[PDB]
Amino acid sequence: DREVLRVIFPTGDSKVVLPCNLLRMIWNAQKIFHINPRLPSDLHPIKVVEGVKELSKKLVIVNGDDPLSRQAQENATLLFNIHLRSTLCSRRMAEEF
Amino acid sequence: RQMDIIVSEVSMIRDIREREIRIYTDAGRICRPLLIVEKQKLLLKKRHIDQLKEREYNNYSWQDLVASGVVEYIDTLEEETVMLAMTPDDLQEKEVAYCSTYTHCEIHPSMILGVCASIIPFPDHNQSPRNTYQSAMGKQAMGVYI
Amino acid sequence: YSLATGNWGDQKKAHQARAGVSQVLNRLTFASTLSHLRRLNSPIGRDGK
Amino acid sequence: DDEEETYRLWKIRKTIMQLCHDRGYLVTQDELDQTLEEFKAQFGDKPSEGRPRRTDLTVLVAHNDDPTDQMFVFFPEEPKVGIKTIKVYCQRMQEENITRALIVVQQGMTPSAKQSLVDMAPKYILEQFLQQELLINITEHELVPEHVVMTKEEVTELLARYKLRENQLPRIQAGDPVARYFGIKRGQVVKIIRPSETAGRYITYRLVQ
Amino acid sequence: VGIRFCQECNNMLYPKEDKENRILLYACRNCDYQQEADNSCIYVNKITHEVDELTQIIADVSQDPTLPRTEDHPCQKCGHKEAVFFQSHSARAEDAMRLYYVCTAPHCGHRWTE
Amino acid sequence: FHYKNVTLGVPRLKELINISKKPKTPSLTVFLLGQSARDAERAKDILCRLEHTTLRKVTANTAIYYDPNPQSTVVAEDQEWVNVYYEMPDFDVARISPWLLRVELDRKHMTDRKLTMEQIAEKINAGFGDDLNCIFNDDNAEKLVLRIRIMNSDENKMDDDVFLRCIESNMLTDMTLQGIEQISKVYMHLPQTDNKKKIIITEDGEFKALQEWILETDGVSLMRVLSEKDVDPVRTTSNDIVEIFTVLGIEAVRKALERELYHVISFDGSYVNYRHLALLCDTMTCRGHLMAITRHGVNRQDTGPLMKCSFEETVDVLMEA
Amino acid sequence: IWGIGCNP
Amino acid sequence: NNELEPTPGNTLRQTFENQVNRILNDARDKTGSSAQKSLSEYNNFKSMVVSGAKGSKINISQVIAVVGQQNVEGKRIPFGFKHRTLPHFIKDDYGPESRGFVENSYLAGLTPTEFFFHAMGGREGLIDTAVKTAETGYIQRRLIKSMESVMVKYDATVRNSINQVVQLRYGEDGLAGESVEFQNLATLKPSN
Amino acid sequence: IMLRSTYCLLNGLTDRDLCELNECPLDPGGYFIINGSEKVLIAQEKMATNTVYVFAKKDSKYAYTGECRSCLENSSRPTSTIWVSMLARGGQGAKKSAIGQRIVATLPYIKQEVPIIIVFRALGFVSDRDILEHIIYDFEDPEMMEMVKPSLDEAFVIQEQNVALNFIGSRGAKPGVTKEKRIKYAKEVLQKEMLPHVGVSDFCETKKAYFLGYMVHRLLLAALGRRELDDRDHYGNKRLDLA
DNA sequence: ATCAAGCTCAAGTACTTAAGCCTGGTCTATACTAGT
RNA sequence: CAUAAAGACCAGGC
DNA sequence: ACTAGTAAAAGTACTTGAGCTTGAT
Ligand SMILES: [Zn+2]
Ligand SMILES: [Zn+2]
């Protein structure tokens, strides 16, 4: 989907309008729970993987179980899930966040 | 000038390139007065000023100033064959000469404003839409009217 | 008649006439009056752009 | 002269090969990447008093899922075409038993010939194109999205899993150059797949009438 | 190029073709008057529009008090050291910002561009 | 007033809101493919190959003489090259017509367009008929002259002075040497912003901007321009949406229309959301054709009679209904 | 009133 | 002296006035910078332009340094007489004084032949505001009558009054424009 | 009666007399009194009369129109306007391409246009040399003679004065039945409303020939690009209507 | 060799259209002809 | 409580 | 005599006009 973004956005920009601001929403959680960014952390990464998968399943635009009412679900919540798995992945949140 | 045959409201336009002469005696034209310049000096001498501050007991007024040949009425068509000097003390001296053959001269260059724009102090310091706003607002200022 | 009502024409042709001439003198301030007695006007219609 | 005209004949021929490749027929890959020199050595150098006549440029192709369905591509000789040439081509189609046909008209038609193309409707459906129109494939353009023609069961799940009627869809008239590129008659639904900046991809539908 | 009038009825003369002596003749469509051609041509259509302004500016324009004046350019015919310059004031505004000079000595009226 | 000539602001908005068939300044941005996109002189003869050139743009004067025999030559110099023609004279089969036409050519506008007398005289003979005869000089000389005679095969009413002035004032305006007749002037520039440059993913994976030569016209005819060699058929667009509706389709007017509204909104640095431009452009082109936002687009729809009467045509809608 | 690119 | 070569796309008049407007427009922004770098910290013009409550950086330049250059009908002040602008100048004059370059400020006051030009420019800028409102207020009625019943149904579809479908999901995603923000994806841009 | 004017009961007084009558000494006057209220006449703008104008309207086949609003010295209930137009270059036709642009005229009380040489030949002056010494004033400029040549070569067949007055007088508000009514109506229109400010009396049509030759000569100066066009907004082309 | 039938493209001639809301003012009911 | 018509033009305010 | 009847572009919609193709010959 890195290669999908280079044909949805052929020019090169990155300022894209989406729902809830994610950097501000990881930066609030670093202060509600007093995150010391100097210690080793206790977030095991295959809680991250199934976390992003089970949340990405709970974002239904088109309520449908059958095909053709399940593929438009994946066309609707497509750019937001590329953005969601882009920002909230395993390396970038065990290292930077 | 000195009023032999012709009443002072006609206009006599000569365009040299077109090779024709137009003379208008028709009604409805609009005009304003100016001061004649000779070779380079004006014609309004001080002899015309010292007996003009004495109007209450001398019988000398604006019509003796027209009939002496020192002011003259110029209208809009004849303001295209004219060469005005806007002020005598700065534009008719011996300097780096812009023009050397002026044919008229204004009285004072603040006589281009109307009745409601002559009640604005310092209009050359304001932004001109503000002058247009107050030139329609001293028409509804409560005062004494008559 | 045609001084009293503005419509610069006849009474029985009161819609083919150029109105707005001969209007009521203005008496708020003395310079309102001196401006109203010295006023020009052009007959181009006032919806054109 | 003649090099521009054989350039036109190569580019028209290549356009028709992608066209019947997109309609769902059997096209060899060698004549899709056909460079100008393989055309120029195969059919001839110059059409000015020459070997590519506008005859022996005709193309007969066959459908994939059924070997019976064939389509003929006619390149008429005279600039404007009357009724008599349409009766010639319709005669050759009569004896050869083929239904579909294209007529790449050089300069233009006559309206009684066009009425002589719309009148045989239930059998012998002929299509009319123009030389000036076929020099660029409009499906590869920047603005034109992906059109996919839909079969009847898929129209049944469209009109059954949105609980629509058939008139409540958006529409498209069958005279724009894309529905003449796909050869679509009244009653058929095209699917348009275009990428958007709010969701990423959007699939909309159109009824052709 | 020019124009031709008749000597009897005073109307316009036209060019005609008579096929005997191979000569262009001018005739009249009113009377029966003939005369031969002196220039042996009809028509001239200057597309370039390169007409010269020196045959259309008048010597009287030096009597104008609203035009600039120069000491630096003298005349050639009379040696007078005062002139008046102006632009094209005409058609063909393709590249028309040249400068035409008129001598201001009376009874000379000499005209030159640079 | 402050910014070529392109309309913006309010009048271009009211050109896009209806579908006005004559926009006040249409144009056609032209991209290039190969070696022509980088070098300036091959872009210059693509520039020459698109812009319309009538014959009167490369003429000096036309002068009708009277030479009854070509061996007379009242013209004071031209006996040399018609004497070269007199070494072997050709086409004296019927007669010799005396009435002559004579065009001088201007070599700045001629050599500016890489033209010569051989393809001009090829065009004004092959294309008009055989009713004329076009002789010309050699390119050694400074002046470029071409003599034209009418064909003798009619002389063996139609007076040829009026006729020859008629074709003289018809060949000056209706000859079309080069170019496309709808396109009147083509410019040439290479952009500074990145929205008209060529953006390539490099080998390492980096978005690179490349300066390219683009042409941009005054007048629109898209189908002949897409069909021209050394022109990119993918990226060439325009701003006349009824002409894109003629050439490309209906989805291309949806997307080109969305791009034009976004172009007039975002010129003063403003920002309107995307749902609104998609809803307007998706309602305006929903039923197949260009439903203009006027009286004549909405009042010809399947909406009821009590909705059209509150829009501009009350009693006429009520009486047809 | 400023310049050609500005405002009148 | 017949020595000015034209530019591609322009006549001789257009290359002349374009490079004169280039010179004069590049020499009033310089005076603007000389005014901007010569203010103070206790100043109040600067304390309004910075804070964003009122003012702009061209008003400081017109009040302090140079008012600028006026223009009617999108170009420099035209020859309203024959070959002159006002009857004080000489015929066919093209300098900066003769055609509207106001080189004084609002505090040094204006000369008469310059206050008249500034009145012309302010007049044009008042006509445009006087005229534009009817055309804009007519467009904004014609659109709102053309679109007035398009709405979101209980199927998350955006249907007409005749129920004929306009969009399958609203805004091509399904979301309302009240609760969205700008974000960055940061996957498309970097190297491999 | 306008107040403070010479036919008022307040002219030439002093301040105590004006204050005695309960009038203000400052109040400038210049207003009427009708049924109690006080009216004032606004001066109405007007375009100047008896002057020859040339414009260029980008609407029709007329490429340069002249105008002359004529008034016979403050005695005219209408105003008699005479145009002299000139037709287009790009008229689609296989004959006019070599012919050229023709000069016309739109006389008052004649709805269809009339070509010029017919109007000049309704005023006498039957020869063409005399008509082209009234319409152009020098005979050494070859450009200005070619510019009027199709206007001559259109009106060759009407080459008599009396059939020219039948031609001009044939198209009135209602055409005459016989011929002498048509030459009557043509002579009274073409002498009494053709240019009233030049002459109304039944002699001296030579001065109308010189002035109409001047009007068409001015159209040929502004068609050959030798002069500018006249400006409508020029405030030397206006007059003002007071009381 | 010309002759109607049917049709298409082009030019000429009318109809319809122009921001919202709010507050004061003066004038006018037809001048002219037959019943009564 | 009830009754103060209605149309045309004009000068203004945001 | 007094007093009541009293005659500015700009989009579309419709019409005419010229010329073509074609079956007949
Ligand atoms: Zn003669
Ligand atoms: Zn000299």
What are the angstrom distances between the C-alpha of C27 and each of B59, C24, C33, D183? Answer: 36, 9, 6, 80
- Are E41 and E8 part of one and the same domain? yes
How many other CB atoms sit within 10 Å of the CB of residue D172? 27
Using the CA of B136, give the nucleotide whose C1' is nearest: K12
Q: Tokens 């110099």 — which residue? A: F77
> In angstroms, rounded to a whole number, what is the distance separating the alpha carbons of residues I163 and I157?
10
Minimum-distance nucleotide, CA of B137 to C1' = K12
| Structural biology method used | cryo-EM
Would you state the structure tokens that stand for residue A89, as one six-digit string? Answer: 């992945």
Any F CB within 8 A of I58 CB: no
Q: CB distance D168–H171 less than 8 Å?
A: no
- The β-bridge relationship of strands B104-105 and B84-85 is parallel
Is residue D197 a contact partner of residue A8, using CB atoms and an 8 Å limit? yes
What's the DSSP call for residue I74? Answer: S
Q: What is the dihedral of CA I166, I171, I177, I178, to 10 degrees?
A: -10
Q: In 3D, which of F30, F54, F67, F3 has the Cα closest to residue F228?
A: F30
Q: Which chains touch G (3 or more CB pairs under 8 A)?
A: F, H
Measured between alpha carbons, how far is D74 from D59 in angstroms, rounded to an integer?
A: 7
**What is the DSSP track for I147-197?**
TTHHHHHHSSS--SHHHHHHHHHTSSSS--SSSHHHHHHHHHHHHHTS-TT
Please count the residues of chain B: 146
Nearest to H16 by CA among H117, H94, H68: H94
Specify which residues F178 forms β-bridges with: F53
- Whole-number Å distance between alpha carbons of H67 and H75: 17
The set of residues, in sequence order, having a beta carbon less than 8 Å from that of A48 and lying 6+ positions away, is: A88, A89, A90, A93, A94
CB D70 within 8 A of CB D20: no
Nearest to F184 by CA among F172, F196, F176, F195: F176
Q: Do D200 and A4 touch (CB under 8 A)?
A: yes
Inter-residue contact A15 to H184 (CB < 8 Å)? yes
B31-35 and I53-54: which strand pairing?
A: unpaired
Closest nt to C35 (CA→C1')? K11
Distance from the alpha carbon of residue E11 to the mean position of ligand 1, in angstroms: 3
Q: Of C27, C35, C38, which is closest to B145 when you measure between CB atoms?
A: C27
DSSP I42: P
Interhelix angle for I161-169 vs I180-192, to 10°? 80
Q: How many domains does chain E have?
A: 2
DSSP state of F75: S
B133: the nucleotide nearest its CA (via C1') is K13
Hunting for tokens 């209009």 — which residue is that? B123
Q: How many CA atoms lie within 13 A of I15 on its CB side?
A: 2
From F53, F40, F36, F5, select the one nearest F189 (Cα to Cα). Answer: F40
Beta carbons of E83 and E102 less than 8 angstroms apart: yes
Please tell me which chains touch C, using 3 or more CB pairs under 8 Å as the contact test: B, H, I
Which of F41, F37, F7, F36 has its CA nearest to residue F22? F7
Tokens matching residue B98: 């812009």
Instruction: Name the residue among D205, D135, D208, D119 with its Cα closest to residue D172.
Output: D208
Distances (CA, A) of F176 to F52, F145, F179, H125: 7, 19, 7, 45
Contacts of D199 in chain H (CB under 8 A): 169, 172-174
Distant-in-sequence, close-in-space partners of D101: CB < 8 Å, separation ≥ 6: D71, D72, D73, D74, D89, D93, D124, D125, D126, D127
- Whether E41 has a binding-site annotation, put simply, is no
Alpha carbons F53 and F178: distance in angstroms, whole number: 5
Which amino acid would we find at residue A12? G
Largest CA distance in chain C: 38
The CA–C1' separation of D193 and L10, in angstroms, is: 38
Cα distance between residue E84 and residue E62, in whole Å: 6
Specify whether E32 is located in the same domain as E56. Answer: no
H runs (alpha helix) in F142-226: 160-171, 222-226
* G1 close to H70: Cβ distance less than 8 angstroms: yes
**CB < 8 Å to F273, chain A:** 17
**What is the CATH classification number for the domain harbouring F126?**
3.30.1360.140
Task: Tell me the domains of chain I and their CATH numbers.
Answer: 53-239 (3.90.1110.10)
CB contact under 8 A, E97 and H12: yes
Q: Could B28 and I240 be called an inter-chain contact, meaning their C-beta atoms sit closer than 8 Å?
A: yes
Nearest CA in chain E to H15: E95
Range of the domain at F46: 40-172
How far is Cα I154 from Cα H163, in angstroms, rounded to an integer?
Answer: 67
Element (H, E) at F150: strand F144-150
* Gap between the Cα atoms of H161 and F212, Å rounded: 49
CA E106 to CA E110: how far, in whole Å?
Answer: 10
C-alpha pair distances (Å), H115 with each of B44, B132, H188: 28, 13, 57
The answer on E40 and E59 residing in a single domain is no
Going by C-alpha positions, the residue among D88, D98, D10, D95 that lies closest to residue D61 is: D98
| Secondary structure (3-state) at I34 | strand
Q: What is the rounded CA–CA span in Å between residue D37 and residue D54? A: 18
**Distance from residue E62's CA to nucleotide J24's C1', rounded to whole Å:** 62
Q: How far is D164 from chain H (nearest CA, A)?
A: 9
Whole-number Å distance, alpha carbon E85 to ligand 2 midpoint, is 13
d(CA H99, CA H81): 12
Q: Is C39 on the interface with H (CB under 8 A)?
A: no
Max Cα distance, chain H (Å): 78
- In chain A, count H helices and then E strands: 6, 1
Cα distances (angstroms) measured from residue C41 to each of A29, C44, I44, I78, I241 = 72, 9, 5, 22, 10
Q: How far apart are CA B127 and CA F116, in angstroms?
A: 61
CB D72 within 8 A of CB D59: yes
Sequence-separated (6 or more) residues with CB below 8 Å from residue A30:
A37, A97
Distance (Å, rounded) from C-alpha H151 to C-alpha F269?
Answer: 30
Identify the DSSP state of I72.
Answer: S
Give CA torsion, residues H74, H79, H84, H87, to 10 deg.
Answer: -90
d(CA D192, CA D183): 16
User: How remote is the CA of residue E93 from the centroid of ligand 2, in Å?
Assistant: 28
The residue of chain A with its CA nearest to that of H157 is A62
Mutant choice from B74, B80, B99 vs E, greatest count of E C-beta within 10 A: B99
Angle at F251 between CA F248 and CA F252, to 5 degrees: 45
Neighbours of D100 (CB within 10 A): 20
List every span in chain D annotated with CATH 3.90.940.20: 137-209
Closest by CA position to D70, among listed D12, D26, D118 = D26
Neighbouring-strand partners of residue F265:
none
With an 8 Å CB cutoff and a minimum of 3 pairs, decide whether chains B and E touch: yes
Q: Which of F266, F181, F288, F191 is nearest to F225 (CA)?
A: F181
Buried b (16+ CB within 10 A) or exposed e, D69-96: ebbbbbbbeeeebeeebbeebbeebeee
Report which secondary-structure segment, H or E, holds I53. strand I53-54
Q: Which residues surround ligand 1, an ion (CB under 5 A)?
A: E 5-6, 11, 28
Shared domain for E71 and E110, answered yes or no, is yes
CA dist I38 → C33, H19, H65, I103 (Å)? 12, 58, 51, 53
- Measured from the Cβ of residue H28, the count of other Cβ atoms closer than 10 Å reads 22
3-state secondary structure of A84: helix
d(CA D170, CA H166): 7
Give span(s): CATH 3.40.1340.10, chain D. 1-136
Collapse the DSSP code of D207 into the 3-class scheme (helix H, G, I; strand E, B; otherwise coil) and give the result: strand
Question: For residue F29, how far is the Cα from the chain centroid?
Answer: 13
Is beta strand F100-105 parallel, antiparallel or unpaired with respect to F144-150? antiparallel
Residues E17 and E52 in one domain: no
How many CB atoms are located within 10 Å of the residue F252 CB?
23
Size of interface F-I (CB pairs under 8 A): 11
Q: Which amino acid is at I218?
A: R
For residue E25, give its domain range. 1-45
Chain H hits for B35, Cβ within 8 Å? none
B14 to B11, B81, B114: CA distances (angstroms): 10, 7, 31
Token pair listed for F85: 């023609």
Alpha helices by DSSP H, listed for D64-188, are 84-96, 111-118, 152-161
Instruction: Give the Cα separation of D188 and I228 in Å (integer).
Output: 65
Instruction: Identify whether the C-beta of residue E85 lies closer than 8 Å to the C-beta of residue E101.
Output: yes
Statement to judge: residues E55 and E110 lie in one domain:
yes
CA F9 to CA F27: how far, in whole Å?
17
- Closest H-chain CA to A82: H185
3-state helix, strand, coil in chain F (%, to 5): 35, 15, 50
**Within 13 Å, how many C-alpha atoms sit on residue H182's CB side?**
5
Nearest to I220 by CA among I130, I150, I155, I164: I150
* CA E86 to centroid of ligand 2, rounded, Å: 16
Backbone angles phi, psi at H90, to 5 degrees: -100, 155
Report d(CA F46, CA F306) in Å as an integer: 57
Q: Which residue type, as a one-letter code, is found at position F190?
A: L
- The resolution in Å comes to 3.6
Place of tokens 């190029």: E1
Decide: residue I49, CB within 10 A, 0-12 exposed, 13-18 middle, 19+ buried: middle
Is domain D137-209 given the CATH code 3.90.940.20 in the classification?
yes
Do both E92 and E112 map to the same domain?
Answer: yes
**Closest residue, chain I, to E6 (C-alpha):** I129
Number of helical (H) and strand (E) elements in chain F, helices listed first: 13, 8
Query: Running DSSP on this structure, what letter comes out for residue F134?
Result: E
Positive or negative, the CA dihedral E76, E77, E82, E85 is: negative
Burial tier of A28 (Cβ tally within 10 Å: 0-12, 13-18, 19+): exposed
Coil, strand or helix: which one is F95? coil
Contact E86/E100 with Cβ under 8 angstroms? yes
Name the residue among E53, E54, E49 with its Cα closest to residue E90.
Answer: E53
Do H69 and H102 meet the contact criterion of CB atoms below 8 Å apart?
A: yes
Q: Which residues place a Cβ less than 5 A from the ion ligand 2?
A: E 75, 78, 80, 103, 108, 110
Claim to verify: residue E78 and residue E108 sit in the same structural domain? yes
Alpha-carbon distances of F30 from F176, F213, I94, rounded to whole Å: 21, 9, 37
- By the CB < 8 Å criterion, does A11 face chain F? yes
List C-alpha distances in Å: F39 to F200, F216, H62. 19, 17, 46
How far is the C-alpha of E58 from the C-alpha of E83, rounded, in Å?
14
What does the longest C-alpha to C-alpha distance in chain F come to?
88
H186 chain-A contacts, CB cut-off 8 A? 14, 86-87
Q: What type of residue sits at position F195?
A: N
CA atoms within 13 A on the CB side of B127: 14
In whole angstroms, give the CA distance from residue C42 to residue I44. 6
Q: Would you say B125 and H107 are in contact if contact means Cβ atoms under 8 Å apart?
A: yes
Q: Which two tokens stand for residue I224?
A: 């050959």
Output the CA E80–ligand 2 centroid distance in Å: 6
Looking at domain D1-136, its CATH architecture is 3-Layer(aba) Sandwich (3.40)
Strand D100-105 and strand D70-74: the pairing is: parallel
Q: How far in angstroms lies nucleotide J12's C1' from the CA of residue I102?
A: 22
Mode of pairing for the β-strands spanning E111-113 and E100-103: antiparallel
Q: Write the CB contacts of H144 (distance below 8 Å, at least 6 apart in sequence).
A: none
Q: For F49, what's the count of Cα atoms within 13 Å in the CB-facing half-sphere?
A: 15
Cα–Cα distance, I107 to I66 (Å, whole number): 12
Find the DSSP H helices in chain B. 62-66, 88-91, 128-134
Backbone angles phi, psi at F284, to 5 degrees: -70, -25
* Strand ranges, E, within B1-146: 11-15, 20-24, 31-35, 71-75, 84-85, 104-105
Neighbouring C-beta atoms of residue F150, cutoff 10 Å: 20
Residue E31 labeled ligand binder: yes
Q: Please enumerate in sequence order all residues whose Cβ is within 8 A of that of I179, keeping only pairs 6 or more positions apart, or say none.
A: I166
> Alpha-carbon distance D155 to F72, whole Å?
84
